[PDB]
Design a protein around this ligand. Structure first.
Ligand SMILES: *[C@@H]1O[C@H](CO)[C@@H](O)[C@H](O)[C@H]1NC(C)=O
Ligand SMILES: *[C@@H]1O[C@H](CO)[C@@H](O)[C@H](O)[C@H]1NC(C)=O
Lengths: 52, 52
């Protein structure tokens, strides 16, 4: 339902993201990947946390 | 000096007005089951179409 997300996000009008703390105890976080390159470093989607 | 009124012309014009009024006020449009225009949440696609 890509169109629905596109629609509701556009209708809202902001990308305002407030970073919120979680527990994530027991899993390795961050989880970079080769495809996503930021500052010539392996990385990932900014708003998503890979759990390994 | 005296004053009197022509009845025939008055009633002819009034009859025209009456026919016009009859063609507007009398009609009734019957409609039972329809879409909903009040939406509690944000549903994306389907909401945009029916609101439009
Ligand atoms: C995180 O999970 C552990 C699981 O044992 C729990 O003891 C701890 O209280 C949790 N921390 C928070 C902030 O919820
Ligand atoms: C991901 O990396 C940074 C340090 O590079 C730090 O926030 C932590 O190690 C990881 N993030 C979280 C939220 O734990």
């Amino acid at each position: 339902d890509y169109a629905s997300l596109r629609s509701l996000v556009a209708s809202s009008g902001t990308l305002e993201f407030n970073n919120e703390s979680f527990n994530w105890t027991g899993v390795t976080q961050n989880g970079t990947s080769s495809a996503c390159i930021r500052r010539s470093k392996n990385s990932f989607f900014s708003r998503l946390n890979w759990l390994t | 000096r005296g004053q009197a009124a022509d009845l025939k012309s008055t009633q002819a014009a009034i009859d025209q007005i009456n026919g016009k009024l009859n063609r507007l006020i009398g009609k009734t449009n019957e409609k039972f089951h329809q879409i909903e225009k009040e939406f509690s949440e944000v549903e994306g696609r389907i909401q945009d179409l029916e609101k439009y």
